[model samples]
Target: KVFERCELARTLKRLGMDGYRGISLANWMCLAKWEAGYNTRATNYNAGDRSTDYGIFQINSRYWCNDGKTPGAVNACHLSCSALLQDNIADAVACAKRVVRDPQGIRAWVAWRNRCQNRDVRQYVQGCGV
Candidate 1:
């Protein structure tokens, strides 16, 4: 977990982010939950949907698991694992790392908080008292 979090944080830091220090970790977890349901084997319902998209980060199986960045997939890169498998923890971290570095400004806790209706993307949101 240390490596995962550190790499993620480092990636964000390199992007000049100061908002998503520790609390932003939960956002990655939430995204992973939505993509993989916390299941190592979790996958989309359809087989044709299979591409390079895999892992908790749902790192595009085509792009991240293949080669080169063509903007075809968000975080495409070649990787070896079971076909359609989503068990690569490192790949997931990598995915999160890349996404957070995007120009969307997700790395800012304040920006994140402001995106919300009730509370800005501060370290804590009021809805669940988090």
Candidate 2:
């Protein structure tokens, strides 16, 4: 699913991420833009370790999920990596919360660290009407 920027903002807000979940709407928007461009089907493969990142939040198969093709996956979220590739994001959100609670926090996402962190991302939702 291709989510409009404003729609994505509203969804995040509805999910209680509007500066209330240790993450802000702006930050989430920025991460979404850089990670998946608001597309639910996004997937990126890291050939070095043969791990794949799936969905809008780009949950990694290395530890958070199982791709069924990656061996020794921890599957911390106890779900198939493919489950995150759909428009429904509830599972994605739940798994993201778990990842954020880890020692790495939101830094688990390289996109957040490189593009969203320490940056003024408010413009990502400037006129979203959220």
lDDT of 1 by residue, 35-101 (tens): 5555555543235644544444455544445433323543333344343354335554544455555
**Positional deviation of residue 107's Cα in model 1 after best superposition, in angstroms:** 10
- The TM-score of predicted model 2 comes to 0.93
Cα lDDT tens digits, model 2, 7-110, are: 88888888877664467778878988999999999999989888999999888998999988876789889889988997988888878877887877778788
Error of 2 at 4 (Å): 0.5
**lDDT score for residue 77 of model 2:** 92
TM-score of each: 0.45, 0.93
**Model 1 per-residue lDDT at 7:** 45
- State in Å the error of residue 5, model 1: 16
Q: Each candidate: RMSD to true structure?
A: 8.2, 1.2
- Each prediction's total of clashing residue pairs, residues at least 3 apart in sequence or on different chains, is 16, 0
Candidate 2, 113: how far from true, in Å? Answer: 1.5
Least accurate stretch of 10 residues (summed lDDT) in model 2?
16-25
